[PDB]
PDB file of C-alpha atoms in Angstrom:
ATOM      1  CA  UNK A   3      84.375 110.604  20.910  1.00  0.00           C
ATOM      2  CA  UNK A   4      87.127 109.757  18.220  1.00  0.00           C
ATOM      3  CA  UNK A   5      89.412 107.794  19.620  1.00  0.00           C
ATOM      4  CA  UNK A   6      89.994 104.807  16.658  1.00  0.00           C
ATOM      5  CA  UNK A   7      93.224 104.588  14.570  1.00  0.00           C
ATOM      6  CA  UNK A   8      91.175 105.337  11.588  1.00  0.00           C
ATOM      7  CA  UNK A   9      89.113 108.341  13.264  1.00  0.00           C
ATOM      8  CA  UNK A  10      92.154 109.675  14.491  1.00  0.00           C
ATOM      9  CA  UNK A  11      94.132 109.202  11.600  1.00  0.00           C
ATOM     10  CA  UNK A  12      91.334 111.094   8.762  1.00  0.00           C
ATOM     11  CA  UNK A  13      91.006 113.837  11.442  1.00  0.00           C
ATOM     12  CA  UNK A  14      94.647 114.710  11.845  1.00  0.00           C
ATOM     13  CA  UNK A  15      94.979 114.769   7.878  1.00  0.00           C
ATOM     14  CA  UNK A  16      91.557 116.909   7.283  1.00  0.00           C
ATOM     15  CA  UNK A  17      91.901 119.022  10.384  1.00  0.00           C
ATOM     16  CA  UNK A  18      95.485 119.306  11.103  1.00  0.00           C
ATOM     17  CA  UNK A  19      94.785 119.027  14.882  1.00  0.00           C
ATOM     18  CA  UNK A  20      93.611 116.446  17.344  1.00  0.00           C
ATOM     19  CA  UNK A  21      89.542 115.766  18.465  1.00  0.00           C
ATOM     20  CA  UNK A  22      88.428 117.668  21.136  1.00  0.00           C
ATOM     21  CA  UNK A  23      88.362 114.642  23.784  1.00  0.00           C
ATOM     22  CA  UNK A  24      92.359 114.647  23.945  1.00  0.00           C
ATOM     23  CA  UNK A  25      94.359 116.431  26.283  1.00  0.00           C
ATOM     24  CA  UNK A  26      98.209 116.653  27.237  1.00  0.00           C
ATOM     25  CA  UNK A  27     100.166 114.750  29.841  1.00  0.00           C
ATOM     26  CA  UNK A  28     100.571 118.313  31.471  1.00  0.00           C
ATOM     27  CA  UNK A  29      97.037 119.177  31.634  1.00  0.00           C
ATOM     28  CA  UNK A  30      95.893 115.959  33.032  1.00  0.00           C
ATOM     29  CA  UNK A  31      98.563 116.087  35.594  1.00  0.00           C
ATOM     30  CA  UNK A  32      97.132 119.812  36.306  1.00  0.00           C
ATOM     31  CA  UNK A  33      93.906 118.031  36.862  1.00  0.00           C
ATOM     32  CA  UNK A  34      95.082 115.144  39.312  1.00  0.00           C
ATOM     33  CA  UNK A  35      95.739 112.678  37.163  1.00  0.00           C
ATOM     34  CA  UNK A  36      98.209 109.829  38.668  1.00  0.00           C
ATOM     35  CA  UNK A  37      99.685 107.554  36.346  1.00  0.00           C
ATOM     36  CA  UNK A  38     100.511 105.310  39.294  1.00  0.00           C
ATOM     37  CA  UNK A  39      96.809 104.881  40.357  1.00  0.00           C
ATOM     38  CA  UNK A  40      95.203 104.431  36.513  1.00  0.00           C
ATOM     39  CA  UNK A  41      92.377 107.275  37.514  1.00  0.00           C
ATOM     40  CA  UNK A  42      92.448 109.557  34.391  1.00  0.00           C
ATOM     41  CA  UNK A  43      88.809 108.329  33.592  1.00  0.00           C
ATOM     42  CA  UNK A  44      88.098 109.822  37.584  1.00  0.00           C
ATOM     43  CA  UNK A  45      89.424 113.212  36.825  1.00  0.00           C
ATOM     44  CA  UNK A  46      89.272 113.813  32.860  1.00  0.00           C
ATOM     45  CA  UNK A  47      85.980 111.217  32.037  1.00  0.00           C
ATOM     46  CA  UNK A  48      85.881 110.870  27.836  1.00  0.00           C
ATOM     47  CA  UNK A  49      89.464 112.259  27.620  1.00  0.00           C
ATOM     48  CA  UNK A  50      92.676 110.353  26.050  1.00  0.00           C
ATOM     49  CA  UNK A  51      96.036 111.539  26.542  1.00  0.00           C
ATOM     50  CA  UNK A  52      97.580 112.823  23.174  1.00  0.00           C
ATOM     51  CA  UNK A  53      98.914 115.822  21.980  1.00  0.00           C
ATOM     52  CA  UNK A  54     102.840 115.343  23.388  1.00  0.00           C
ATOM     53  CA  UNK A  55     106.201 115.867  21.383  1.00  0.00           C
ATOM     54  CA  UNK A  56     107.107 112.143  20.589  1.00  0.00           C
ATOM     55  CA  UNK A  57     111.021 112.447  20.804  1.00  0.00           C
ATOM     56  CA  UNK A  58     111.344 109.748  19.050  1.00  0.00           C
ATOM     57  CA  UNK A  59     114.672 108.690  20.425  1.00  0.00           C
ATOM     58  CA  UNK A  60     115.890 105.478  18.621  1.00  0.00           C
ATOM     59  CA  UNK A  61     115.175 107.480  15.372  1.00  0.00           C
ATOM     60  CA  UNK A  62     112.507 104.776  14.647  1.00  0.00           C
ATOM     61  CA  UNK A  63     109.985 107.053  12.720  1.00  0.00           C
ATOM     62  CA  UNK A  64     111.290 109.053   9.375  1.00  0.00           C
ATOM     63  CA  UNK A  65     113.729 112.183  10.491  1.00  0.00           C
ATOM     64  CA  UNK A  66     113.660 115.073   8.906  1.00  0.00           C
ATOM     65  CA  UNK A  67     114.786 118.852   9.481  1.00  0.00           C
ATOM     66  CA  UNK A  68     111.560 120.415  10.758  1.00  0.00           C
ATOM     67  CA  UNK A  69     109.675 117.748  11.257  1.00  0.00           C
ATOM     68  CA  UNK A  70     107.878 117.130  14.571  1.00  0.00           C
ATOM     69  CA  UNK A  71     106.204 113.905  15.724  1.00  0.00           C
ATOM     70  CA  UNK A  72     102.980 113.486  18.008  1.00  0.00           C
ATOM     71  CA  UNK A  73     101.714 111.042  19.776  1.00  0.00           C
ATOM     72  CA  UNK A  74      98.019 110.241  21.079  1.00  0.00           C
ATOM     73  CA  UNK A  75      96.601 107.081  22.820  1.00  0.00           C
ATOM     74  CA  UNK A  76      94.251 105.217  21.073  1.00  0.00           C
ATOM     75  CA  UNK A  77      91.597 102.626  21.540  1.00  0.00           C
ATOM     76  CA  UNK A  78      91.954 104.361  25.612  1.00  0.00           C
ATOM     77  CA  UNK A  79      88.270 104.094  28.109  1.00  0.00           C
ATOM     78  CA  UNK A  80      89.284 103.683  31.159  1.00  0.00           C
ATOM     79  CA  UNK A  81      92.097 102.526  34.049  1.00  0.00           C
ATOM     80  CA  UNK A  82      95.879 102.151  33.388  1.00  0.00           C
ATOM     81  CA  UNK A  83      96.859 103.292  29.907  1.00  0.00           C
ATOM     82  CA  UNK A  84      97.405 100.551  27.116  1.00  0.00           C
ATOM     83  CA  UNK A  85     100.321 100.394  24.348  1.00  0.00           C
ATOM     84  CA  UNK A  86      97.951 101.546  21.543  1.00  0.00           C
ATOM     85  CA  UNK A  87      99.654 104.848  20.124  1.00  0.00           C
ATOM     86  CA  UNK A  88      99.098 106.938  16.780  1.00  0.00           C
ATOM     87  CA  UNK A  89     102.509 109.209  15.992  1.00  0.00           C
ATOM     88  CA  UNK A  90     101.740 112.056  13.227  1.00  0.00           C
ATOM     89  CA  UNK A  91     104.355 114.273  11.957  1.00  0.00           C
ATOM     90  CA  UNK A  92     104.134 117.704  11.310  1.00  0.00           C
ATOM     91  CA  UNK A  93     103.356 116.989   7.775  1.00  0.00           C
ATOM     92  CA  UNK A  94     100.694 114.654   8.572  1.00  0.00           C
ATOM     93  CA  UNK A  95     102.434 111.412   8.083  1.00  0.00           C
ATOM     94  CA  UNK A  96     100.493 108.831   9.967  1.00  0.00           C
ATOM     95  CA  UNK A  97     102.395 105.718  12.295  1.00  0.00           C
ATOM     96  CA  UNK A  98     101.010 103.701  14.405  1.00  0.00           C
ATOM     97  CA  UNK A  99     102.486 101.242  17.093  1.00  0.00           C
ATOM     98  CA  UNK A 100     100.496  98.522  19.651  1.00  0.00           C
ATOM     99  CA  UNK A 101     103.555  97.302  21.593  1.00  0.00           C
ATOM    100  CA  UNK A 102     104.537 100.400  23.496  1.00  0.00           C
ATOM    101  CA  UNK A 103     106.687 102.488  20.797  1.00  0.00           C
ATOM    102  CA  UNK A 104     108.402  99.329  19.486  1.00  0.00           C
ATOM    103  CA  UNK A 105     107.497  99.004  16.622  1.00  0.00           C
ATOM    104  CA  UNK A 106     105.763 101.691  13.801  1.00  0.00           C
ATOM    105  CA  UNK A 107     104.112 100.736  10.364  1.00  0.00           C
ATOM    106  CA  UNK A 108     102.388 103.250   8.402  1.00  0.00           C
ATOM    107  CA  UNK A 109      98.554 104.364   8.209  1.00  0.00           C
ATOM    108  CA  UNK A 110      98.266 107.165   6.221  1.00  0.00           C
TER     109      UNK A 110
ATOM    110  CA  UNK B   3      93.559 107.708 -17.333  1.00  0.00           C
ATOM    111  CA  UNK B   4      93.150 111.829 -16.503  1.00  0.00           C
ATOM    112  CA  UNK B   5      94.737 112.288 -13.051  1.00  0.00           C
ATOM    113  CA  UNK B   6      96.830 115.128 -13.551  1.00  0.00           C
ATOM    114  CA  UNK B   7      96.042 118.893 -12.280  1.00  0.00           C
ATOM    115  CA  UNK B   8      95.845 119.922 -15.671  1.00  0.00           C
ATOM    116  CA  UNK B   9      93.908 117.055 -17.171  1.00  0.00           C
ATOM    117  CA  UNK B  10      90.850 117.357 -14.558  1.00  0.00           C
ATOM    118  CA  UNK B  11      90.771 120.677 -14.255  1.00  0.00           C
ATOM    119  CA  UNK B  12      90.247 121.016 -17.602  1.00  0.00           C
ATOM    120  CA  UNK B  13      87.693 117.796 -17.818  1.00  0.00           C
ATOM    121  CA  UNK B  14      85.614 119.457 -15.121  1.00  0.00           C
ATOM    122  CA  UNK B  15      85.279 123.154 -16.284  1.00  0.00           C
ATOM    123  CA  UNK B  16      84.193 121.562 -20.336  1.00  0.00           C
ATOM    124  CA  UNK B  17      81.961 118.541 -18.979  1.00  0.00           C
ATOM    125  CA  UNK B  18      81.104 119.257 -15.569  1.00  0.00           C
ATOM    126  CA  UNK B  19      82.126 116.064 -14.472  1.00  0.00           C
ATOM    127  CA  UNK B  20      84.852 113.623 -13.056  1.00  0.00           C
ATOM    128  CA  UNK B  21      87.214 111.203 -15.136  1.00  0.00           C
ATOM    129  CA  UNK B  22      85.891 107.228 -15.087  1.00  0.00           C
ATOM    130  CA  UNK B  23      88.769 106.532 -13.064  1.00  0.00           C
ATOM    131  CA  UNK B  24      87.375 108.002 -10.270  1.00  0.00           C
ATOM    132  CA  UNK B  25      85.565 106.812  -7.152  1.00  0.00           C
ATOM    133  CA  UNK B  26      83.812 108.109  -3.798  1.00  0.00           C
ATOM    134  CA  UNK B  27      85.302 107.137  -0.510  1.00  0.00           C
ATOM    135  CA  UNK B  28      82.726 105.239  -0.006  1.00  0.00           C
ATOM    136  CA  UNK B  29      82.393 103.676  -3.133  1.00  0.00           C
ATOM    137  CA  UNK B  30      86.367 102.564  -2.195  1.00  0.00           C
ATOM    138  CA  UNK B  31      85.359 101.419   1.107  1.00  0.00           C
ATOM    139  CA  UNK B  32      82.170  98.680  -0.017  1.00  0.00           C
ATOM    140  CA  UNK B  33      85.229  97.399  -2.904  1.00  0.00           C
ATOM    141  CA  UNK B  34      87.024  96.760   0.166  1.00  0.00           C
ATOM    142  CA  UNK B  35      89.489  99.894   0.611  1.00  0.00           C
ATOM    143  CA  UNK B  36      91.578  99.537   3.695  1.00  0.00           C
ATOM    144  CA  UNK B  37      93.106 102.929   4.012  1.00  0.00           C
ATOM    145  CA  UNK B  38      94.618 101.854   6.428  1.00  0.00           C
ATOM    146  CA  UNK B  39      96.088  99.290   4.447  1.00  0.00           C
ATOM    147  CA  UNK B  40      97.256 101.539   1.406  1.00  0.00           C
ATOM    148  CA  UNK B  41      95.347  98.552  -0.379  1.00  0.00           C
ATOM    149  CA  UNK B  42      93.502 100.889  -2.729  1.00  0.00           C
ATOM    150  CA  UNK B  43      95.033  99.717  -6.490  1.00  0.00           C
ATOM    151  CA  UNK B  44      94.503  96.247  -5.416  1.00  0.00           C
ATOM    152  CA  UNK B  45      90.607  96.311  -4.939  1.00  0.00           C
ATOM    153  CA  UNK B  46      90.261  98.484  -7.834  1.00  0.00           C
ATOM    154  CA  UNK B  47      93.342  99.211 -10.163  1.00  0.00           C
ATOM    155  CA  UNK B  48      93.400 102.430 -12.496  1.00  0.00           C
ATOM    156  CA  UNK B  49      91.009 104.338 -10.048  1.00  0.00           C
ATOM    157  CA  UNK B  50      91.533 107.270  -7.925  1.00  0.00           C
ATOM    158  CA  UNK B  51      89.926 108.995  -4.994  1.00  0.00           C
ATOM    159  CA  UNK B  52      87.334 111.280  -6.298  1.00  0.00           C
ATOM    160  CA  UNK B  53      84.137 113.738  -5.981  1.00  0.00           C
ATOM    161  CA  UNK B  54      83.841 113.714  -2.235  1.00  0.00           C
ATOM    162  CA  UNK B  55      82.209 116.543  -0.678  1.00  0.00           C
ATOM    163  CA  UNK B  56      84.602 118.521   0.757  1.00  0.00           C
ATOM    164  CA  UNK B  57      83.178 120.659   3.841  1.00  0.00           C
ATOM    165  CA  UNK B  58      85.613 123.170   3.769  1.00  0.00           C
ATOM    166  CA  UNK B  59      85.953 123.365   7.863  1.00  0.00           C
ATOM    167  CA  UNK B  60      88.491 126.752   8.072  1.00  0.00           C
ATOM    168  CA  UNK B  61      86.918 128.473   5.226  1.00  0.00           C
ATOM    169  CA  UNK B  62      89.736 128.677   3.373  1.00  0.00           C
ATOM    170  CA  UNK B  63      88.056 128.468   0.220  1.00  0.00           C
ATOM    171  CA  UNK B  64      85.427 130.762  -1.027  1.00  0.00           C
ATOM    172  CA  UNK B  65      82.237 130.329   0.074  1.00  0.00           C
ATOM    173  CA  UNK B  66      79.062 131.576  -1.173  1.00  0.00           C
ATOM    174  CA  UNK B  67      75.512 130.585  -0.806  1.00  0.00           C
ATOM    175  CA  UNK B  68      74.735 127.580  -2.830  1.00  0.00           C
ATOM    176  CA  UNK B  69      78.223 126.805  -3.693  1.00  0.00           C
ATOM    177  CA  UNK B  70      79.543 123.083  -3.123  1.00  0.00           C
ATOM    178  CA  UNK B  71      83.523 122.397  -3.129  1.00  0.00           C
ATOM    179  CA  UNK B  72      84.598 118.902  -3.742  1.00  0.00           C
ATOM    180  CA  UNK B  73      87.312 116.865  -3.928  1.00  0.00           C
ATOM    181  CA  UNK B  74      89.322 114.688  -6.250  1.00  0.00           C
ATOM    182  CA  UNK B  75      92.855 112.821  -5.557  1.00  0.00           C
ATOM    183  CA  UNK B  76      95.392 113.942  -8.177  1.00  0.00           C
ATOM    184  CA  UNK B  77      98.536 112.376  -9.653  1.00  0.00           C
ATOM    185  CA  UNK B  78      97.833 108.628  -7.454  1.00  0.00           C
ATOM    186  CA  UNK B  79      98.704 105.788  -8.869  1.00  0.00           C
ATOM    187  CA  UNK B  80      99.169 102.981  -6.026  1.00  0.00           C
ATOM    188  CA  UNK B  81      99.795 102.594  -2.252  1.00  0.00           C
ATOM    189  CA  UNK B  82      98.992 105.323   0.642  1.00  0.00           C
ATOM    190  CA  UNK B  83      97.131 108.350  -0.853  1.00  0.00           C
ATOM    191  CA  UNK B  84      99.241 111.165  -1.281  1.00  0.00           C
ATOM    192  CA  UNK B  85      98.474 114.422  -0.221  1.00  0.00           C
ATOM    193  CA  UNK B  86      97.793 116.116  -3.505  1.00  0.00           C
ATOM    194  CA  UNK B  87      94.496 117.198  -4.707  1.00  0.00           C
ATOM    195  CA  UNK B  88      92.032 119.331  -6.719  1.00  0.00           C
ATOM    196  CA  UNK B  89      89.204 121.058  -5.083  1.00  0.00           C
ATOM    197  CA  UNK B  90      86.392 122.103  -7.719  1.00  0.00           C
ATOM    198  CA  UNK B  91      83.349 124.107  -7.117  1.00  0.00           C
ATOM    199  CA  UNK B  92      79.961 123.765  -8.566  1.00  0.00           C
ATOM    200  CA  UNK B  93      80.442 126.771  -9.917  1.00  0.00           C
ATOM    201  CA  UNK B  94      83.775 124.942 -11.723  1.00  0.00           C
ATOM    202  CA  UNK B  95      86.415 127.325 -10.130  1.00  0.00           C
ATOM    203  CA  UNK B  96      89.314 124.926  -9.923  1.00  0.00           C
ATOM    204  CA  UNK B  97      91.770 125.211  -6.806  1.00  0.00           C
ATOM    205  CA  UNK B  98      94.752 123.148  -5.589  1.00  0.00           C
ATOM    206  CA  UNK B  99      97.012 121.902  -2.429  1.00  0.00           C
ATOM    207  CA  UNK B 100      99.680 119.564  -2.504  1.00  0.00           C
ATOM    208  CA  UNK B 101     100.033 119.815   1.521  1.00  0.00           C
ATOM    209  CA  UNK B 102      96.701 118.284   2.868  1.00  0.00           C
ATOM    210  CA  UNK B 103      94.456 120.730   2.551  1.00  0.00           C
ATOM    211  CA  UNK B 104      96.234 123.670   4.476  1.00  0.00           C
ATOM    212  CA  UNK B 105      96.982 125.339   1.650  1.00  0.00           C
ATOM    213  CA  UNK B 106      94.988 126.002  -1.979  1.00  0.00           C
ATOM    214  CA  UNK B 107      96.081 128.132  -5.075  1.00  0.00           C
ATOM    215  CA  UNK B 108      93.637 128.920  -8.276  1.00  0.00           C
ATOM    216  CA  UNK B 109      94.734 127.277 -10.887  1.00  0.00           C
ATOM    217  CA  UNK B 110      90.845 127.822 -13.280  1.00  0.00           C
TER     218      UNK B 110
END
């Protein structure tokens, strides 16, 4: 399982996708995930949420026209989800943030 | 210092070899490289990213039995890598991308 800053980070930029252990919001929904009661390690064992369109609402990470940012949850095992969070761009720039999307700094 | 498209390409093809100023990941990495850091010119100025085995996951280069592509980081000078580089075959064809690795031209 890659689920590391680094590991995530070198397989974005090589690969130009996420590893194989993450899965959407949507599809763990789909597969009775409830935020609410932390079970995502009950339904989807070795999965991480990741995958979703970041919105990226307070403009934090660099605009640009045609540029879409990711995110994925790092450093994630098991119960509740934690505030560890890579954001890629469609052009593989590489943010990451630990406080819940508060604050970005660059990996890659 | 030869880190230009140009300046390899043509160093490889006539001596079969990479510039000095050119290190292995992991050579980076036991000089203490942080990539996550963008520390590389601080733990060892002048060099570059170079000669890595690159596995060439989507086939997008041509393969052929016995033929090893690797790769070398071109026109870096300090900070993040960028996302330019030459890919050179034992054979010495010479190819480029300056978008990651999702797309490569001939240029030997």
């Amino acid at each position: 399982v890659i689920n590391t800053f680094d590991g995530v980070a070198d397989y974005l930029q090589t690969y130009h996708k996420l590893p194989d252990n993450y899965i959407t919001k949507s599809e763990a929904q789909a597969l009775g995930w409830v935020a609410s009661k932390g079970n995502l390690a009950d339904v989807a064992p070795g999965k991480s949420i990741g995958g979703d369109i970041f919105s990226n609402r307070e403009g934090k990470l660099p605009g640009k026209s045609g540029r879409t940012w990711r995110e994925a949850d790092i450093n994630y095992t098991s119960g509740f989800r934690n505030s560890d969070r890579i954001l890629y761009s469609s052009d593989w720039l590489i943010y990451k943030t630990t406080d819940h999307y508060q604050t970005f700094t660059k990996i890659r």
